[PDB]
Amino acid sequence: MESKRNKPGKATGKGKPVGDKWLDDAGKDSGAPIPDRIADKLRDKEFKSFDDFRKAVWEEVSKDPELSKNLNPSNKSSVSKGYSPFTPKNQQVGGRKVYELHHDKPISQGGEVYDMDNIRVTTPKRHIDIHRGK
Numbered sequence: 334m335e336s337k338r339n340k341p342g343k344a345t346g347k348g349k350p351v352g353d354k355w356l357d358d359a360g361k362d363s364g365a366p367i368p369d370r371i372a373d374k375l376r377d378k379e380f381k382s383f384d385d386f387r388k389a390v391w392e393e394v395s396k397d398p399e400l401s402k403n404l405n406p407s408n409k410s411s412v413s414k415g416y417s418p419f420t421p422k423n424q425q426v427g428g429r430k431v432y433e434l435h436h437d438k439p440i441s442q443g444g445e446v447y448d449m450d451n452i453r454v455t456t457p458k459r460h461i462d463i464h465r466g467k
């Protein structure tokens with residue numbers, strides 16, 4: 334059966350205060366946190382799937398001047414439509430070229446799918462290292 338990340342749910346969690354260079358943390362240790370201002374927009378909203386949630390995250394990033402400041406024109410256009418933005422080329426891996434959402438406590442260990450304190454923003458390079466080649 335497919336992963337439970339495909340089932341509907343409501344967003345929970347507080348997120349964390351970040352600065353305008355927040356995505357520079359995505360390629361570090363446990364990636365960057367969901368910003369507290371994004372969590373304040375999405376908490377209690379119902380989503381159809383984790384991919385639906387991901388789209389809402391980037392849409393809210395596009396509407397926050399501070400969080401979207403350092404995105405280039407193409408990436409600003411991507412996030413306004415709910416698409417994940419490209420990371421710097423040195424943090425891409427093969428066909429995986431955009432920021433990825435990672436569950437800190439894995440869903441396989443009971444981690445919650447839509448808990449914004451359990452979701453990190455990572456680069457492809459960092460995320461494939463975290464899961465040892467997957």
Ligand SMILES: [Zn+2]
Nearest residue numbers: 434435436460
């Ligand atoms: Zn992960």
